[PDB]
Amino acid sequence: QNLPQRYIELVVVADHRVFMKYNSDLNTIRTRVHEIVNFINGFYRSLNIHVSLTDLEIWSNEDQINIQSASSDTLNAFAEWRETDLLNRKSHDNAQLLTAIELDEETLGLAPLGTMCDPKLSIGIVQDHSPINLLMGVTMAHELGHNLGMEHDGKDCLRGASLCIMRPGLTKGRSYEFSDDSMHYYERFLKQYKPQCILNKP
Amino acid sequence: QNLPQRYIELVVVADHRVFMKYNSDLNTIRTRVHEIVNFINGFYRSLNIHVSLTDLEIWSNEDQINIQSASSDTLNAFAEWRETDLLNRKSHDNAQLLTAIELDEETLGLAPLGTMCDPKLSIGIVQDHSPINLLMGVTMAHELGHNLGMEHDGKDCLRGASLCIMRPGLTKGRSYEFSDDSMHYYERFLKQYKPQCILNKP
Numbered sequence: 001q002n003l004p005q006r007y008i009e010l011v012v013v014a015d016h017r018v019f020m021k022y023n024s025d026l027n028t029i030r031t032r033v034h035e036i037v038n039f040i041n042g043f044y045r046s047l048n049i050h051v052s053l054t055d056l057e058i059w060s061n062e063d064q065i066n067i068q069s070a071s072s073d074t075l076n077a078f079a080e081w082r083e084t085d086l087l088n089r090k091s092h093d094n095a096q097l098l099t100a101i102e103l104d105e106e107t108l109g110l111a112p113l114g115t116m117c118d119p120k121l122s123i124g125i126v127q128d129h130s131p132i133n134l135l136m137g138v139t140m141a142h143e144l145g146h147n148l149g150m151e152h153d154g155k156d157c158l159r160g161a162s163l164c165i166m167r168p169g170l171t172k173g174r175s176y177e178f179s180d181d182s183m184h185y186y187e188r189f190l191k192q193y194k195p196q197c198i199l200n201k202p
Numbered sequence: 203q204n205l206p207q208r209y210i211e212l213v214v215v216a217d218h219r220v221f222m223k224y225n226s227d228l229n230t231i232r233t234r235v236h237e238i239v240n241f242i243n244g245f246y247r248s249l250n251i252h253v254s255l256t257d258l259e260i261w262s263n264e265d266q267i268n269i270q271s272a273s274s275d276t277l278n279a280f281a282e283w284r285e286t287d288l289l290n291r292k293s294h295d296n297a298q299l300l301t302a303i304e305l306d307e308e309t310l311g312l313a314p315l316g317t318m319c320d321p322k323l324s325i326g327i328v329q330d331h332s333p334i335n336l337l338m339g340v341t342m343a344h345e346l347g348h349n350l351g352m353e354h355d356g357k358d359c360l361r362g363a364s365l366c367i368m369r370p371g372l373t374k375g376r377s378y379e380f381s382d383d384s385m386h387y388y389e390r391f392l393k394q395y396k397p398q399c400i401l402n403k404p
């Protein structure tokens with residue numbers, strides 16, 4: 001287990017549909033997100049990654065992109081905007097989108113593989129699908145995981161009593177952990193792609 | 203549960219018996235210890251502790267304390283040496299003595315409980331008992347665990363396929379982890395004692 005200290009500067013963007021859903025109360029969205037970054041961190045402990053929230057942007061007025069049901073299409077719109085608007089203003093390593101649209105083929109999240117630190121592709125879309133901050137943490141941790149070159153595990157993946165975070169579907173539980181495969185998908189990525197943006201302590 | 207980033211400044215002291223074991227070659231002793239620490243770091247990824255090899259003291263000429271079979275006699279003797287001699291020469295957090303003497307009840311390790319940062323009791327004893335750096339790494343990690351307020355786990359403690367590091371006796375294996383209990387023992391340790399010495403990045 002030779003993994004050096006890495007740091008991710010995360011910016012979560014909450015859409016207009018999220019804004020409406022929590023009765024327009026911003027302090028409610030802030031707290032949820034903050035708790036979620038807390039669960040992510042606990043999961044990434046063994047990987048030696050520390051996830052830091054640099055900015056949380058709530059589209060309280062109007063949606064900056066056309067939020068669609070087709071996950072890959074919204075993924076597309078969010079990439080162009082990250083590059084030309086958010087990254088133009090805020091220096092950040094990764095950007096995740098918190099949408100409340102009921103995603104097409106029952107997709108609860110989507111992110112491209114092995115893309116951490118790419119101007120266009122260092123992103124992910126997470127659907128606000130559970131009132132339990134834990135199942136949302138595993139969700140966002142799952143998508144960040146794909147950014148770090150992690151492929152899926154088996155459906156019957158378990159690590160002790162814990163559920164492997166990189167499973168293809170979401171099963172409810174109380175203990176979730178990353179599998180040895182995930183640790184290996186990341187070890188190779190770090191040596192292969194060698195992400196430059198994740199070394200600075202925020 | 204998220205545990206903060208802590209850093210232990212470790213000094214390993216190899217006695218004359220260890221010096222006479224590796225044919226007076228300091229290089230080999232240096233390479234044995236360097237790898238043992240790497241293994242300690244891997245076990246500690248989960249608890250957010252990084253261990254640094256601050257200095258390696260090899261008593262090449264003669265022992266500075268009376269090395270005795272009685273583990274407890276040697277522990278208390280090494281404790282007062284560390285406080286009056288070593289601490290006043292090398293600023294460090296914890297000091298582990300690597301001895302080559304066959305300890306009393308077939309003892310392979312001994313260290314004080316919940317004593318990290320103490321000028322006298324932030325110590326430990328490790329017997330050079332296995333030519334496999336991994337087992338040597340668990341032995342030193344077990345004793346640093348005691349220093350961090352960790353008490354023993356069950357006779358047959360298992361966190362998945364991995365053997366708990368805090369078992370009262372060493373069973374030869376290929377993967378080791380710290381159990382939930384050990385993670386809670388250290389949590390309480392941090393909250394209760396607020397050790398200052400483990401906050402600076404070396």
Ligand SMILES: CNC(=O)[C@H](Cc1ccccc1)NC(=O)[C@H](CC(C)C)[C@H](CSc1cccs1)C(=O)NO
Nearest residue numbers: 107108109110139142163164165167168169170171
């Ligand atoms: C990148 N997207 C994916 O890999 C697909 C999307 C999908 C789902 C169902 C059908 C077709 C596609 N899986 C997921 O999103 C997952 C499941 C959804 C239903 C919440 C995914 C992981 S679930 C688990 C993690 C640990 C134990 S179980 C999740 O919570 N991620 O954030």
Ligand SMILES: CNC(=O)[C@H](Cc1ccccc1)NC(=O)[C@H](CC(C)C)[C@H](CSc1cccs1)C(=O)NO
Nearest residue numbers: 309310311312313341344365367369370371372373
């Ligand atoms: C503070 N002293 C102790 O707790 C006593 C000392 C002792 C040993 C044998 C018999 C009686 C007493 N046990 C230990 O040292 C242990 C035993 C020795 C054999 C290495 C302890 C084993 S933990 C485990 C990690 C993985 C599986 S089991 C160790 O590797 N530690 O470093």
Ligand SMILES: [Ca+2]
Nearest residue numbers: 093197198200
């Ligand atoms: Ca960065």
Ligand SMILES: [Ca+2]
Nearest residue numbers: 211295399400
């Ligand atoms: Ca220190």
Ligand SMILES: [Zn+2]
Nearest residue numbers: 142146152168
């Ligand atoms: Zn996935």
Ligand SMILES: [Zn+2]
Nearest residue numbers: 344348354370
């Ligand atoms: Zn013990």
